[PDB]
Design a protein around this ligand. Structure first.
Ligand code: GDP
Ligand code: GDP
Ligand code: MG
Lengths: 348, 101
């Protein structure tokens, strides 16, 4: 478990914040939010929790993500979690967090596969995290089931648009490997909000459920459908694994063996896996934080220039200074005589 | 393929399933959530009452270990008037292996 690529980026945020906080101003470290987009049963929830590094989300077959979950990571001296609707309560075990998520979902949506556009806000504190916003959205569908109205498609789409048309947001498009990539819904959305692929990152899931004799080699090599940032293959847990409480360590080891042994993927074994997706995202934050430094320097540079002309004199102040008093006297008298002539004569 | 490939293919479907004296076979794999099928959405829009539509489930040997399609084959998840029929075809390895029908 855990995400150790944050450690190299936490102090940079602290140092810059301490730099501005001393002057009574805050640092515009507007780190982007990460939205996970995909279709029903694509694997989005499994992907997202691997970036957080904690096992707390609900996952499995069926419509499990019935409400948008917004996770806010906050740097803190101790690790704990809390909800907005459980004010005054403290969560010290993520299993309780997962159960609360299901309970809060059913209380509003019912049990017959309902949805609700009102999100759930989870705030996890920890010393090993940045101040990040992570969004876990419901998957998209075509036809209603259970109590879903005829317009279930568009209600889900609007929930999606509110979080992906927002600037400064990484779109993490997850698609299954055992379905034709031309018929993925994630990529249809990405190419409508991010035409040039500057934000979009593709993930290919379910590489271990391919039909025998077929592979995704022309996908992971960015040949079938060119994507600016390429595709990353991942092998998450199976539904049996979820119900079997399979450990994370075993899942990662199996993912490593898979890519190292599959004949069509060995030459890409180092571009794929859970840890590589962490590295790409972390590197994506680091590029953003370092791309904003020029603005911060210019702000401080402008302020010094404005203040410098006066503090040059204040720093040399001595109360016993006849020269200052007489210089002040000549300035006041010259100001009065100019103001006086202005009002009477019209000069100036 | 131009940007409007989606609506060019759809306009071809709407020339054969938008008329009477026609049966429609809604084909969809079983290794994906049935709620996301494009076959049913088209059939439901053209044949709301399910008079003509018949559902087919094509890939039952490719389902993730630990689940099954009973909720569909028993016409419970998305009840369809004429039910659903499950089939198991030749894999890609078999097509290239010259396996007899
Ligand atoms: N074996 C395997 N199972 C997967 C993979 N990706 C997703 N699944 C399964 O697909 C189901 C759906 O997972 P989930 O992410 O909750 O779908 P979601 O509704 O999009 O969140 C789960 O049972 C996962 O175990 C994969 O790469 N390999
Ligand atoms: N293993 C397996 N493969 C299947 C099954 N049904 C279809 N396929 C595969 O589906 C692939 C494409 O089928 P096809 O009918 O051409 O899809 P189409 O583009 O709609 O015609 C073929 O390679 C088949 O081997 C199945 O039940 N099991
Ligand atoms: Mg989900």
């Amino acid at each position: 478990m855990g995400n150790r690529g944050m450690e190299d980026l936490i102090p940079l945020v602290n140092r810059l914040q301490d730099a501005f906080s001393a002057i009574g101003q805050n640092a515009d470290l507007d780190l982007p939010q990460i939205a996970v987009v995909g279709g029903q049963s694509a694997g989005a929830s499994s992907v997202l929790e691997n970036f957080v590094g904690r096992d707390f989300l609900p996952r499995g077959s069926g419509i499990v993500t019935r409400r948008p979950l917004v996770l806010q990571l906050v740097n803190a001296t101790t690790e704990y979690a809390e909800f907005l609707h459980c004010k005054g309560k403290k969560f010290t075990d993520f299993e309780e967090v997962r159960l609360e998520i299901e309970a809060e979902t059913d209380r509003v949506t019912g049990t017959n596969k309902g949805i609700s556009p009102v999100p759930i806000n989870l705030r996890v504190y920890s010393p090993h995290v940045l101040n990040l916003t992570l969004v876990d959205l419901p998957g998209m569908t075509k036809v209603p089931v259970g109590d879903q109205p005829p317009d279930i498609e568009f209600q889900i789409r609007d929930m999606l648009m509110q979080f992906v048309t927002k600037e400064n947001c990484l779109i993490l498009a997850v698609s299954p490997a055992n379905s034709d990539l031309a018929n993925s819904d994630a990529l249809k959305v990405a190419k409508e909000v991010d035409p040039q692929g500057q934000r979009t990152i593709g993930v290919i899931t379910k590489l271990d459920l391919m039909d025998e004799g077929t592979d995704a080699r022309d996908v992971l090599e960015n040949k079938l459908l060119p994507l600016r940032r390429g595709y990353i293959g991942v092998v998450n847990r199976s539904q049996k694994d979820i119900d079997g409480k399979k450990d994370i360590t075993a899942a990662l080891a199996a993912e490593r063996k898979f890519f190292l042994s599959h004949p069509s993927y060995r030459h890409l074994a180092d571009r794929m896996g859970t840890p590589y997706l962490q590295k790409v995202l972390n590197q994506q934050l680091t590029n953003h934080i370092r791309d904003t430094l020029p603005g911060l320097r210019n702000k401080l540079q402008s302020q010094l220039l404005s203040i410098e002309k006066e503090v040059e004199e204040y720093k040399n102040f001595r109360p016993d200074d006849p020269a200052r008093k007489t210089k002040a006297l000549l300035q006041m008298v010259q100001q009065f005589a100019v103001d006086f002539e202005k009002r009477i004569e019209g000069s100036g």
